[PDB]
Subunit: 169 residues, 4 copies
């Protein structure tokens, strides 16, 4: 009976968003299981496992926007979920996304969008904020800037909405 | 207690897909209300109304792929739904998409994708087929080619899944 | 030897962006031919023609964001360009997009994105701003708010870049 | 005076597509520099370097479709190109994409699409096939199935078109 809040964070912006979403989830009648993934190479929160994904009632996926796509260490953990898609899990379970960007120009909607693609592959029901595809944060080219009362509200709103939908389902 | 199957059709390909989805919906424990929209200019099934959208338990949206986007007469009917977004309806209700293309090259996924965008704006919960974003049909450059046993299965599957989710919700 | 700046405007926000882009185009060594399209129904700048599109050296496409997609009257004019895609024109010619939104939440990137899809169908070379997919404007829920020195800079930058690329090509 | 054909391959499908594109590039008046990237973890062609990307006249990017996104080892190599975006390179240079999928359902257009996002971030001019966003290959759930005369034609066509555009630029 938990929503998995699964994310990756480089300079900790996506990490705080994760926590707030978790609060939302709790407010929504569910236990938040907040997890991350390890760095990758060719040469914090606890690390997520396949079984974490297999057993969640629903999922919130987070990454910093990295050139319009999700961060590779997260992509790496998902690339290792064939089994779960093949036996058709995550199917039926609700999901949402969230992102952080260190950039004025843009790139969050599209990244949120690119992260809903796989969830729709795993056959999940995707929901947003009524950005509209998911919770977003501007971090400022310092990576420094902190959430606002507004961004905090949106994170919990989404977390709460995700949990309530898993409930209603 | 009905799923609105809302679509536009030029040469009737999307129209047959609509019907099959409707069958799915019935199989799924719901009444299908199948509707279309009128042609637009500067100079079949019954026509949809705003109240049709306001009162549905859930929604299936269909168009032929027209240069990677949905057909304008459909876009025109949606552009007239501000009121519904403003008072935040459709929110919470499930939705799916479907498309027809007269083309080898491609363009269906992207069009399905571009049609899920607005549903996520109106705050809906979007579901696919576990293409993966929605039911698709190749019509062949004649516009002629008919559904297969396979494409028919997918249409009802989606319709049934949409209705069952509205149910579970 | 002209770049077609083709757009639709409801409350004139996209219209001013069009003009500025046109200035950019001129700065870039090209004549701007600024055109719009007429309203559509079931029951300003000059109107664009098919031949306007056939003969341009390059293209800038503009719309207000309407539920994550381009405005229907524009979609309607493009839907009438089969001939041009079929005989494979626009192919090789550069193109860019621009948008206006009356909304805080979001929706511009995705709309810009959904408008680059067709250009890639017609086989065009698409370029952005080095949002990153094209020039954007927040209009404020009044539709009232005017361009900034910043948004103005971006519009001409894009127009200038589009024209220069058509040049280099 | 070379087009960088940059790709990742798991079971060698994207690898053959790379080679064919390279042939295209040669036919188009350019030297193909075909490169890949190493596997990533938490615990063939030569490997690409940052300087390979810095000095190309243009770029073709390839991956297998991995849940609607590009493969993580490729994403990892791109995530290490901040410097190049920051000093605004790749800007002005043409680019294309290509993909392989082991799947009936779908996912190639969207993945091609998700790979054009970053290229548009790095400020590149993106071109397709006049799928329409780039060259695609069905590998069959064996990963086994080989290119067709048709898919081969498309790969070289794209490679040739990419090189010719870099030429014209």
């Amino acid at each position: 009976p938990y929503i998995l809040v699964l994310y990756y964070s480089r300079h900790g912006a996506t990490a705080e968003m994760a926590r707030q979403i978790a609060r939302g989830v709790e407010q929504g009648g569910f236990e938040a299981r907040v997890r991350t993934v390890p760095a990758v190479s060719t040469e914090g929160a606890l690390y997520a496992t396949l079984e974490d994904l297999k057993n969640c009632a629903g999922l919130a996926l987070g990454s910093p926007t990295r050139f319009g796509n999700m961060a590779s260490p997260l992509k790496y953990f998902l690339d290792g979920t064939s089994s779960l898609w093949l036996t058709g899990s995550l199917v039926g379970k609700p999901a949402a996304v969230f992102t952080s960007t260190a950039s004025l120009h843009g790139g969050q909607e599209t990244t949120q969008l690119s992260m809903l693609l796989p969830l729709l592959h795993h056959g999940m029901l995707v929901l947003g904020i009524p950005t509209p595809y998911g919770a977003s944060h501007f971090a400022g080219a310092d990576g420094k800037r902190s959430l606002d009362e507004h961004e905090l509200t949106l994170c919990r709103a989404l977390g709460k909405r995700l949990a309530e939908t898993a409930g209603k389902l």
